[PDB]
PDB file of C-alpha atoms in Angstrom:
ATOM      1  CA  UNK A  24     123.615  41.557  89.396  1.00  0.00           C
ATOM      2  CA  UNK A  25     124.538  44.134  91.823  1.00  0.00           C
ATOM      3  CA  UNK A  26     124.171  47.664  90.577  1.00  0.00           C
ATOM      4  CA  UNK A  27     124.960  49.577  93.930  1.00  0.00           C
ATOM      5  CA  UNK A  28     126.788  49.521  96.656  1.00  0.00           C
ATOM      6  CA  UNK A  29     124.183  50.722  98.859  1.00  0.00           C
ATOM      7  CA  UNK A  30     122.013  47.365 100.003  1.00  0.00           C
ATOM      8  CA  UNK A  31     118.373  49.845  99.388  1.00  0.00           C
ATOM      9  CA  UNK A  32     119.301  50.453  95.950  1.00  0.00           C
ATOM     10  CA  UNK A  33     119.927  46.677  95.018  1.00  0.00           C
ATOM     11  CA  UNK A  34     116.523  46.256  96.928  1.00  0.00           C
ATOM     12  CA  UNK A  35     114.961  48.585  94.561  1.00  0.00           C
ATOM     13  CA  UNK A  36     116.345  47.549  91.666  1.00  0.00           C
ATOM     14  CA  UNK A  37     115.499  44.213  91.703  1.00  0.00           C
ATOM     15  CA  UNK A  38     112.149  44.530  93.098  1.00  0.00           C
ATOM     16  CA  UNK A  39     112.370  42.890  96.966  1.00  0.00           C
ATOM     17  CA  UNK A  40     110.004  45.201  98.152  1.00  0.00           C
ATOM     18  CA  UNK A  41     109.152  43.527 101.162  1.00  0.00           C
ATOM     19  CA  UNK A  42     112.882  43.588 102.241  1.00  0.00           C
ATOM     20  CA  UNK A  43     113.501  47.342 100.971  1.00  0.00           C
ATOM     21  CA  UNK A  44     109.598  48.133 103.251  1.00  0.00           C
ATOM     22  CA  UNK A  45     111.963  46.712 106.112  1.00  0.00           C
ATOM     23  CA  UNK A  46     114.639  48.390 106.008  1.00  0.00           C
ATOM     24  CA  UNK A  47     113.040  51.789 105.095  1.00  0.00           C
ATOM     25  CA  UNK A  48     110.019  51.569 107.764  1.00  0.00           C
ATOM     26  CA  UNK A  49     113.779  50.660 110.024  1.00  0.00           C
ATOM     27  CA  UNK A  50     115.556  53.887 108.454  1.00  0.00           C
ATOM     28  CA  UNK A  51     113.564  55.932 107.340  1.00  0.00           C
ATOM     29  CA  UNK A  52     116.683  57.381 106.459  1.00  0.00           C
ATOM     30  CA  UNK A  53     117.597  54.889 103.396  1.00  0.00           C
ATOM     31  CA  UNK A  54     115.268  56.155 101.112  1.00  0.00           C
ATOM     32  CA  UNK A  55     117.312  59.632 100.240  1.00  0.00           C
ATOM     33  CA  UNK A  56     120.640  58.128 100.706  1.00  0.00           C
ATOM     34  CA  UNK A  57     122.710  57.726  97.804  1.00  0.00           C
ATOM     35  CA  UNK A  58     125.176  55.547  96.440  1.00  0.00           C
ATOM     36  CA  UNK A  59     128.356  55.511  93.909  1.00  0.00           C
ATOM     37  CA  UNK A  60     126.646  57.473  91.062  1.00  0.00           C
ATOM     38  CA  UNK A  61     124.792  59.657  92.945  1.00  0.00           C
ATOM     39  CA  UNK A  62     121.404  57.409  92.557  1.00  0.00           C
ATOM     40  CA  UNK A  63     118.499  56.983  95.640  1.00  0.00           C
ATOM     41  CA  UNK A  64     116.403  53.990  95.396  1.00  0.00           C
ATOM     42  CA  UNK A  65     114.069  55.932  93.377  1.00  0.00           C
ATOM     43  CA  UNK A  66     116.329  56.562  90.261  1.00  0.00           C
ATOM     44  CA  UNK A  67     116.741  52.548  90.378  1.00  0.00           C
ATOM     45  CA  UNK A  68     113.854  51.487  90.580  1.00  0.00           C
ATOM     46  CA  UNK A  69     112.508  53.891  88.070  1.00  0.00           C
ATOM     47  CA  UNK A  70     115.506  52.007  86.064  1.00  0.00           C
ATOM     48  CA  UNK A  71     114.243  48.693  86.153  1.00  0.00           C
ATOM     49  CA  UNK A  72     110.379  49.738  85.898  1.00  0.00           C
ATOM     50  CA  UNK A  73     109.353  48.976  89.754  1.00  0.00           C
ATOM     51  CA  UNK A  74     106.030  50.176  89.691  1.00  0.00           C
ATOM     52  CA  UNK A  75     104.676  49.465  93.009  1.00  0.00           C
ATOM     53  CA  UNK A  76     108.391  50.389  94.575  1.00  0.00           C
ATOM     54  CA  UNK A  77     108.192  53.951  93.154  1.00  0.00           C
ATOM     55  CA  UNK A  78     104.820  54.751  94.348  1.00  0.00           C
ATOM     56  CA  UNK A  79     106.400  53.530  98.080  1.00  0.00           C
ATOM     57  CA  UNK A  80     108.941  56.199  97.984  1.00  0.00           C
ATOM     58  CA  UNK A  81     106.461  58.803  96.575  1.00  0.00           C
ATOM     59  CA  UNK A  82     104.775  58.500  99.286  1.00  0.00           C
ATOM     60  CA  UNK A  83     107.208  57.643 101.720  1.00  0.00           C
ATOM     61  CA  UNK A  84     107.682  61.823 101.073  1.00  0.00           C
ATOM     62  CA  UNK A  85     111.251  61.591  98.938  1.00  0.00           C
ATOM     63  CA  UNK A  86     112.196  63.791  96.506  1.00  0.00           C
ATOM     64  CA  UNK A  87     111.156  63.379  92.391  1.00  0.00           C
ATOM     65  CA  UNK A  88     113.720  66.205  90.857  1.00  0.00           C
ATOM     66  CA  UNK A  89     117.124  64.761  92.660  1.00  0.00           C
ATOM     67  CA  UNK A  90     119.911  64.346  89.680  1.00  0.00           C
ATOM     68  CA  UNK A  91     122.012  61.332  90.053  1.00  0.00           C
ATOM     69  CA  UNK A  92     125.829  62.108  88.718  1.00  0.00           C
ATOM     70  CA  UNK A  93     125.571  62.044  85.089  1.00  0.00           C
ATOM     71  CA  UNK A  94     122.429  64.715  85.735  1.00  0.00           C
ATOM     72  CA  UNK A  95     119.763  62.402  85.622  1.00  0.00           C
ATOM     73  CA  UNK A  96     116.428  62.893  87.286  1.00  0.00           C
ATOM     74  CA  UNK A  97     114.264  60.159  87.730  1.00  0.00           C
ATOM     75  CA  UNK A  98     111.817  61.259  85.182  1.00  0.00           C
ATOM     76  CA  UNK A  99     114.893  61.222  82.926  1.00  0.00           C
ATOM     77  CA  UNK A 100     115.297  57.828  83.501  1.00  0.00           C
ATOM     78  CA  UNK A 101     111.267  56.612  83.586  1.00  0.00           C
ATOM     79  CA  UNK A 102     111.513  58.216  80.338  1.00  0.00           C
ATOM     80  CA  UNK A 103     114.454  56.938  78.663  1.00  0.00           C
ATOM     81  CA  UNK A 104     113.547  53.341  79.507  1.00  0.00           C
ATOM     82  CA  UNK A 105     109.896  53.440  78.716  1.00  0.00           C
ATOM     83  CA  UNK A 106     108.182  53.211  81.617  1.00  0.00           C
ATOM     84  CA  UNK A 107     105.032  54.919  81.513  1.00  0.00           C
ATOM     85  CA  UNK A 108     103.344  53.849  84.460  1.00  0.00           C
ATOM     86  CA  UNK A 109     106.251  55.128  86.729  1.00  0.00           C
ATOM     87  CA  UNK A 110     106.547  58.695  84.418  1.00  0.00           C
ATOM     88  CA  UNK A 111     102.430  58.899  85.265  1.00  0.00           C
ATOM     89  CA  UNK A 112     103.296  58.574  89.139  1.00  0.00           C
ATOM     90  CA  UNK A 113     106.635  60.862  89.035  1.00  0.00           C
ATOM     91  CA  UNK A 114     104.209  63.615  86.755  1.00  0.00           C
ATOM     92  CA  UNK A 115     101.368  63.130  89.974  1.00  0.00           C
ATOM     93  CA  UNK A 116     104.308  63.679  92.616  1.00  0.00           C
ATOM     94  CA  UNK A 117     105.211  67.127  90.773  1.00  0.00           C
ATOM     95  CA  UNK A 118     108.080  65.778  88.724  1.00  0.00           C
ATOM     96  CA  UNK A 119     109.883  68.689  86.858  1.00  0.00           C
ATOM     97  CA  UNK A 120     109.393  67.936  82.944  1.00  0.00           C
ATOM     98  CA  UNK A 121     112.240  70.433  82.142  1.00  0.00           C
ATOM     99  CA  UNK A 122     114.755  69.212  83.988  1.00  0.00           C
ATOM    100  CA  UNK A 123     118.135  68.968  82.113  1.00  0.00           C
ATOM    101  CA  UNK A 124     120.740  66.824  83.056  1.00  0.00           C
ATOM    102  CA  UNK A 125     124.252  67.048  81.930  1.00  0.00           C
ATOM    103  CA  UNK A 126     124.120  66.770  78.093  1.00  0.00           C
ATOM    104  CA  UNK A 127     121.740  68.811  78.005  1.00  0.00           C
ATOM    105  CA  UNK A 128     119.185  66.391  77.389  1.00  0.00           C
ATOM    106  CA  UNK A 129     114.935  66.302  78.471  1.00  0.00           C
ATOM    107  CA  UNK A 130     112.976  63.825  79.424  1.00  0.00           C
ATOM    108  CA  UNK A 131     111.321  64.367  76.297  1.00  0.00           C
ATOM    109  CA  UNK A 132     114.351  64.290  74.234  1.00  0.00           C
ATOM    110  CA  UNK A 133     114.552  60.506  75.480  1.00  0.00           C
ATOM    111  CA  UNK A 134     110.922  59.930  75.108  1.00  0.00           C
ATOM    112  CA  UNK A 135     111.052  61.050  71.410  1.00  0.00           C
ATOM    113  CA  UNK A 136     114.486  59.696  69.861  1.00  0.00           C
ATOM    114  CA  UNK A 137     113.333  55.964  71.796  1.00  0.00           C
ATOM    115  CA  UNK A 138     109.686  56.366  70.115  1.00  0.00           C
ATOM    116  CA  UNK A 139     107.872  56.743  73.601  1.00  0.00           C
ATOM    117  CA  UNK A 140     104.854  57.844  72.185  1.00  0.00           C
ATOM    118  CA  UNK A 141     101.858  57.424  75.089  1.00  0.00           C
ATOM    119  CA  UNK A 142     105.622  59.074  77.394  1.00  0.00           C
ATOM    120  CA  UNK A 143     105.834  61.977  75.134  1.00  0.00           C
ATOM    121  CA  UNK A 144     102.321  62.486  75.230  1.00  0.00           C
ATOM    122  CA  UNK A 145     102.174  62.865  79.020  1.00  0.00           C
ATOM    123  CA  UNK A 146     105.601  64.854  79.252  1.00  0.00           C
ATOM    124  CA  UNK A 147     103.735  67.158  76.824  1.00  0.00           C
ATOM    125  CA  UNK A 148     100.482  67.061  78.625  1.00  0.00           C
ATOM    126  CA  UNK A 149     102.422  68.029  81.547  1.00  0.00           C
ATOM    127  CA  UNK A 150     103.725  71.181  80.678  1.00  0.00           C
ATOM    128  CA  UNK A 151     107.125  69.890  78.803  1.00  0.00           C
ATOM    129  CA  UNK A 152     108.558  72.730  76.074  1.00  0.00           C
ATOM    130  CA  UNK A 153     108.398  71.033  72.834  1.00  0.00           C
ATOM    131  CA  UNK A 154     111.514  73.345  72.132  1.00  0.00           C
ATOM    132  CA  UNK A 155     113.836  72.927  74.453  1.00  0.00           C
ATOM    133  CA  UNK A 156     117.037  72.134  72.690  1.00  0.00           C
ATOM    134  CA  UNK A 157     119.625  70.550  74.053  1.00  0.00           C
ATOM    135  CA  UNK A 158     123.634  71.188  73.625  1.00  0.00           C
ATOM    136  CA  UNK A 159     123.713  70.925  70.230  1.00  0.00           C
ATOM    137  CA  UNK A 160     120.442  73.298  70.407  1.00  0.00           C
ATOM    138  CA  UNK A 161     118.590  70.516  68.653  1.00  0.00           C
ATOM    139  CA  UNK A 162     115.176  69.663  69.317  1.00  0.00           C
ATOM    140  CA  UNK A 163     112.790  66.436  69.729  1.00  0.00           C
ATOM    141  CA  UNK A 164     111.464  67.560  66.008  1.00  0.00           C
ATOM    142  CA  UNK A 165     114.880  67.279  65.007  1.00  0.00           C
ATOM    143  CA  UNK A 166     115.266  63.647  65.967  1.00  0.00           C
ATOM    144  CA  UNK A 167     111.775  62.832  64.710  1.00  0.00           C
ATOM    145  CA  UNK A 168     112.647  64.150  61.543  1.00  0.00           C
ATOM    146  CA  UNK A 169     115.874  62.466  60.927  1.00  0.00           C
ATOM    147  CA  UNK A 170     114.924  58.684  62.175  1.00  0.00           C
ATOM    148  CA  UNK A 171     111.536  59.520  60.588  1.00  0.00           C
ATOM    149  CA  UNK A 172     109.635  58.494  63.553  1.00  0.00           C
ATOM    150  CA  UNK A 173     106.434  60.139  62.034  1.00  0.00           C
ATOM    151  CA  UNK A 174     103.823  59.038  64.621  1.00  0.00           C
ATOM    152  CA  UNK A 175     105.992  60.642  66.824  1.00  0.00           C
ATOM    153  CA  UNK A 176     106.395  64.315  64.194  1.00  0.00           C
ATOM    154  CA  UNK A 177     102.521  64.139  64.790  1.00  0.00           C
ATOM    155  CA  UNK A 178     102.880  64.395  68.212  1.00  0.00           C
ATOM    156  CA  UNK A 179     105.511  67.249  68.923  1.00  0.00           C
ATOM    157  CA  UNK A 180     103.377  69.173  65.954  1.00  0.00           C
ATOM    158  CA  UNK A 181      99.715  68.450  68.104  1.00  0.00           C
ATOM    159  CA  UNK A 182     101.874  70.330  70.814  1.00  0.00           C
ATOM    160  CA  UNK A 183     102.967  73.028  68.916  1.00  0.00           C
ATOM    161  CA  UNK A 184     106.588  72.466  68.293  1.00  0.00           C
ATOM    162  CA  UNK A 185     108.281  74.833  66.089  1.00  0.00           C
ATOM    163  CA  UNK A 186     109.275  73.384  62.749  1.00  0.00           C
ATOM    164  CA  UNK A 187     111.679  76.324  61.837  1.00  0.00           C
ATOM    165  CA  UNK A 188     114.341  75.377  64.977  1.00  0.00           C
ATOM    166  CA  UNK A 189     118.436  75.348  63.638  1.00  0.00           C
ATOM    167  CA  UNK A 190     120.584  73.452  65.872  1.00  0.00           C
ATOM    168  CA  UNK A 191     124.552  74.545  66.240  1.00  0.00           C
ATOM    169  CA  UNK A 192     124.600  73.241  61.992  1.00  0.00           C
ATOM    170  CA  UNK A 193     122.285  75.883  61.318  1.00  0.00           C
ATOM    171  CA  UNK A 194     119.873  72.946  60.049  1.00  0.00           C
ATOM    172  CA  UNK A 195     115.920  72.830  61.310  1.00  0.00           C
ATOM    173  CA  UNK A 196     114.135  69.368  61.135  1.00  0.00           C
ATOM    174  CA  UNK A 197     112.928  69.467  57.600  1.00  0.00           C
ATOM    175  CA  UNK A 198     116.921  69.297  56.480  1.00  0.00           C
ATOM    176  CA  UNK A 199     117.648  66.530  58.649  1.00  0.00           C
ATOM    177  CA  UNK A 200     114.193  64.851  56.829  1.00  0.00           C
ATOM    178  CA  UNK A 201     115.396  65.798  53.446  1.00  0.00           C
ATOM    179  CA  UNK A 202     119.172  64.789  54.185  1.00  0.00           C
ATOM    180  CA  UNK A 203     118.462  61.286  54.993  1.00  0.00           C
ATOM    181  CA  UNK A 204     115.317  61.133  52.687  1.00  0.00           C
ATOM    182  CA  UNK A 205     111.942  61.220  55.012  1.00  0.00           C
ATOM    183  CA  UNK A 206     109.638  61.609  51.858  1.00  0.00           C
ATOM    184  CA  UNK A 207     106.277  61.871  54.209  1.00  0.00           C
ATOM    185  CA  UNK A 208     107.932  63.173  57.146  1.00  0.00           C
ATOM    186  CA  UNK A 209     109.442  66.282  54.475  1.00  0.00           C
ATOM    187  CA  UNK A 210     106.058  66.721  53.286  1.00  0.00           C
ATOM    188  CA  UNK A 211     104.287  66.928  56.563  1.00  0.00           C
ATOM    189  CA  UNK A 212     106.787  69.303  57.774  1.00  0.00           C
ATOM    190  CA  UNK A 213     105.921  71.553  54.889  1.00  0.00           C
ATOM    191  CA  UNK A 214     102.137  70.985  55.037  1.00  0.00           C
ATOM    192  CA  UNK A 215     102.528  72.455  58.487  1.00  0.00           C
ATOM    193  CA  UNK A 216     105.001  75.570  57.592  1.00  0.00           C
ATOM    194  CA  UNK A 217     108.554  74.389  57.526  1.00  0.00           C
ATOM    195  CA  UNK A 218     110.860  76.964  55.365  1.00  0.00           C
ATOM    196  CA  UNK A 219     111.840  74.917  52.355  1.00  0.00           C
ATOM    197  CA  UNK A 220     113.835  78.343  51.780  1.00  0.00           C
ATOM    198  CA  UNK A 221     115.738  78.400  54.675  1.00  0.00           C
ATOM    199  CA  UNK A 222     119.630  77.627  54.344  1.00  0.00           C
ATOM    200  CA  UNK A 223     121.931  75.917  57.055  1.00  0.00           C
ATOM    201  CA  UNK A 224     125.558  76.888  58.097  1.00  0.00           C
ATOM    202  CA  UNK A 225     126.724  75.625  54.193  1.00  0.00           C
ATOM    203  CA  UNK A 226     124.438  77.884  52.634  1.00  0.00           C
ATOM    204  CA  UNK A 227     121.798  75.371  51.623  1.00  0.00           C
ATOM    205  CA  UNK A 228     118.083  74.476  51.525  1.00  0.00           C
ATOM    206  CA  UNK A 229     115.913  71.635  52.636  1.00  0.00           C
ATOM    207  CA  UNK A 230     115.066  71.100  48.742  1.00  0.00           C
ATOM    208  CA  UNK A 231     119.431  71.592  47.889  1.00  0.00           C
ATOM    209  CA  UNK A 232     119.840  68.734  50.501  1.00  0.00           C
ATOM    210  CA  UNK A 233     117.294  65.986  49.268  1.00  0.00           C
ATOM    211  CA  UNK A 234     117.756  63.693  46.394  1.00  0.00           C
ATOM    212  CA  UNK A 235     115.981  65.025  43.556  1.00  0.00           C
ATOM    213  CA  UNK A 236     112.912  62.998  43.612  1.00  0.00           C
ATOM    214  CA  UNK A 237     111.982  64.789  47.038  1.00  0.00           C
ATOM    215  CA  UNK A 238     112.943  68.732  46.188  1.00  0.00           C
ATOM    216  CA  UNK A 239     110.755  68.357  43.186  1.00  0.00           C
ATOM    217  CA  UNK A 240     107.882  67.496  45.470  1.00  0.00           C
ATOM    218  CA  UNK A 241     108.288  69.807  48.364  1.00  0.00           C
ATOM    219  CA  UNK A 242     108.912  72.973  45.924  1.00  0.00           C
ATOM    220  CA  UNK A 243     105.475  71.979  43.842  1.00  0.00           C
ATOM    221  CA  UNK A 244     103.981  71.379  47.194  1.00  0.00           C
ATOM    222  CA  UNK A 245     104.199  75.223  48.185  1.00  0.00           C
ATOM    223  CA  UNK A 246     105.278  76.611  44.542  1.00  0.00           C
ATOM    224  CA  UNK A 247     104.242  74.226  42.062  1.00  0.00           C
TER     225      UNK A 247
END
């Protein structure tokens, strides 16, 4: 199904890279043009996961940072939909990691809340801020920590992301584990030097905001 109303885009979404190598190679032009949202054949094809299409346009000299209308880069995009071969080509071409786009949203905010572990890594690896938040001023950690993607917790920590962040709710990651009960997650939040003092925009504590069986363990985990 038709995505665009520019032919290239279709082309690149769909992966008729024979016919999209004709009409570029014809107009040169048709790589950077852009269609209803905003979107290049890049940002489609990194959609769809067109490997060998991407690396055309790389090459071909387009631009890796250009924000379709919603604000989303094409790393945004590689990112969100888990294609790691095209993020590893888009990182090589100079790909911004820190690029925002309109909600305020990382590549690495994608990478992390979708579980895009060997994507996070390289995002990372390439110079992305563990930290930023987004409009909400909540972190990767912060999603981690509440879907208890731990794998993932291991990750942003290896990378040095704070543990002691408050989004707009005044709550860091270790709430959001203790809220929705992340019983390892909690505890290796703590083992690595999450406040299970510090109080959110209600007043309360990580240990005030976990059922019982968990408070016990974090406060004999650093009291005892």
């Amino acid at each position: 199904g038709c995505v665009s109303n520019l032919m290239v885009c279709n082309l690149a979404y769909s992966g008729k890279l024979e016919e999209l190598k004709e009409s570029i190679l014809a107009d040169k032009s048709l790589a950077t043009r852009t269609d209803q949202d905003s979107r290049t054949a890049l940002h489609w094809a990194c959609s769809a996961g067109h490997t060998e299409i991407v690396e055309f346009l790389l090459q071909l000299g387009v631009p890796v940072n250009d924000k379709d209308d919603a604000g989303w880069s094409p790393l945004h995009i590689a990112a969100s939909a888990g294609r790691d071969e095209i993020v590893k080509a888009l990182l090589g071409k100079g790909a911004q990691v820190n690029a925002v786009n309109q909600n305020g949203c990382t590549p690495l905010h994608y990478a992390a809340s979708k579980n895009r572990h060997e994507i996070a890594v390289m995002l990372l690896e390439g110079g992305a801020n563990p930290d930023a938040k987004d409009h909400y001023e909540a972190t990767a950690m912060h999603r981690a920590a509440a879907k208890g993607n731990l794998k993932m917790i291991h990750i942003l920590l290896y990378y040095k992301a704070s543990t002691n962040i408050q989004d707009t709710e005044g709550n860091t990651p270790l709430h959001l584990a203790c809220d929705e009960e992340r019983v390892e997650e909690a505890k290796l939040l703590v083992s690595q030097g999450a406040s299970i003092y510090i109080e959110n925009k209600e007043e309360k504590t990580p240990l005030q905001v976990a059922k019982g069986g968990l408070g016990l363990i974090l406060k004999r985990m650093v009291e005892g």
